[PDB]
Amino acid sequence: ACDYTCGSNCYSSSDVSTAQAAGYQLHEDGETVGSNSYPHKYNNYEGFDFSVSSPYYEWPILSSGDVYSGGSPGADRVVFNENNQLAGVITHTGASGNNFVECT
């Protein structure tokens, strides 16, 4: 009964919207955090079928429930668009190399 299951990680829609709110504000503020500068453009190399419109931005969602603030990003991400609409929750867990797969 996870709202989203990323490997052995379990996220609720509430966890996802809390992560999305912090990431979108950073986006809107035109700021970033961490060595890899999150949030940033998510191009959809995977060709996932997102229902919302481009552009997409990837922001880390942490299994610890704390909001990402610059450290190790982990394998899971929340992808939201320019309008602050959730596109999907994805993960490196189960995918090869740097690819992603959608969290069920």
Range of the domain at 92: 1-104
Residue in 27, 40, 82, 102 annotated catalytic: 40
In 1-104, at which residue ranges do the beta strands (DSSP E only) sit? 4-6, 9-11, 40-42, 56-60, 76-81, 86-91, 101-102
Tell me whether residue 40 is one of the annotated catalytic residues. Answer: yes
Structure method: X-ray
Tell me whether residue 27 is one of the annotated catalytic residues. Answer: no
Whichever domain contains 97, its CATH number is: 3.10.450.30
Tell me whether residue 58 is one of the annotated catalytic residues. Answer: yes
Q: Which residues pair with 26 in a beta bridge?
A: none
Q: Which of 36, 72, 8 is nearest to 58 (CA)?
A: 36
Contact assessment for residue 39 and residue 23, using Cβ atoms and an 8 Å cutoff: yes
Q: Which of 103, 75, 67 is nearest to 88 (CA)?
A: 103
- Please state the domain count of the chain: 1
Residue in 31, 58, 82, 102 annotated catalytic: 58
Contact assessment for residue 90 and residue 103, using Cβ atoms and an 8 Å cutoff: yes
